[PDB]
Design a protein around this nucleic acid. Structure first.
Ligand SMILES: [Ca+2]
Length: 314
DNA sequence: GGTAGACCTGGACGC
DNA sequence: GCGTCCAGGTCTACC
């Protein structure tokens, strides 16, 4: 009863709600779609993970987003804790307004948006987001979710244990940068990315200013940021893009990869024009990103999230 | 300045 | 049941 993961039904007094219609958010369409790989649907409709150094369980009803946090006596979340949630989901941004705009300038989006409401963007933590997507290159969401889990168990701060699951906070830069980490990561199966993680942790700390440098980009231009990030080992244009979009507040950043090419080609009959190649190339990718930008606007990145999400559901 | 592979890993085809 | 193909790409020789 008081043990294991909570459920709205079983521990009523331990939950608190945030006004939020499904139309403005769909947990099942956001949390497992590859923005963040730290959420797991332990119970049906209930998602658990680490949000702001604490473990939470989220679930929703037609017009409410019910929350519950595990920290010392169990109690409903506090208004300030609850704000951590609203901030993480950027609830101030009205998906309805965005969806409307995109829908009016793109008949196709209109078409797709009907069956996929509530796809918004999470505003993630720089570090967690940087190393997660570093693990994402040339890989699939299932493996990624796995690696990121082991990485946190191995180098993350132990939070709490629910049932047979022990939650860890995301590793710090110091930890990731530690002696012999690459070896360890390699045993955890991070593949050739083991080195990217280690190399980047050190690069950030031992030659870029450390955590502050990174957090500084959140105020720099998408241009600056994307530029700055590519410096890092394992970080290219696409990865630098996912990070700008989901952690650095650059909503026009449009991650381009095979997924987007399939979307572009199949639903827009898109082709590179001012580019040499016919297929994916650094020059063609940039073009595609620009295409989607001029199509959707300042929040092109968010619109991208909507389709990319629906492309995983194909 | 732009290309063509090589690449950890492991579930998904297809022979 | 065994070799391709592919997944939230990046990095590196090479013409
Ligand atoms: Ca590939």
């Amino acid at each position: 009863g008081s043990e294991g993961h909570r459920t709205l039904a079983s521990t009523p007094a331990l939950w608190a709600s945030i006004p939020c219609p499904r139309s403005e958010l769909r947990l099942d369409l956001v949390l497992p779609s590859g923005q963040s790989f730290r959420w797991r649907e332990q119970s049906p409709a209930h998602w658990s993970g680490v949000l702001a150094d604490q473990v939470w369980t989220l679930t929703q009803t037609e017009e409410q987003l019910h929350c519950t946090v595990y920290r010392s006596q169990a109690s409903r979340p506090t208004p300030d804790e609850l704000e951590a949630v609203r901030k993480y989901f950027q609830l101030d941004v009205t998906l309805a307004q965005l969806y409307h705009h995109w829908g009016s300038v793109d008949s196709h989006f209109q078409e797709v948006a009907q069956k996929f409401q509530g796809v918004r963007l999470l505003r993630q933590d720089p570090i967690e987001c940087l190393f997660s997507f570093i693990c994402s290159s040339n890989n699939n969401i299932a493996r990624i979710t796995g690696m990121v889990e082991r990485l946190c168990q191995a180098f993350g701060p132990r939070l709490i244990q629910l049932d047979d699951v022990t939650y860890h906070g995301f590793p710090s830069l110091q930890a990731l940068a530690g002696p012999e980490v690459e070896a360890h990561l390699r045993k955890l199966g991070l593949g050739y990315r083991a080195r990217y993680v280690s190399a980047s942790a050190r690069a950030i700390l031992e030659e870029q200013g450390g955590l502050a440098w990174l957090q500084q980009l959140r105020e720099s231009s998408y241009e600056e940021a994307h530029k700055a990030l590519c410096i890092l080992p394992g970080v290219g244009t696409k990865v630098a893009d996912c990070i700008c979009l989901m952690a650095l507040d650059k909503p026009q950043a449009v991650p381009v990869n095979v997924h987007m090419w399939h979307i572009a080609q199949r639903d827009y009959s898109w082709h590179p024009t001012t580019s040499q190649a016919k297929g994916p190339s650094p020059q063609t990718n940039k073009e595609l990103g620009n295409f989607f930008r001029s199509l959707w606007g300042p929040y092109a990145g968010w619109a991208q999230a909507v389709l990319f999400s629906a492309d995983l559901r194909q």
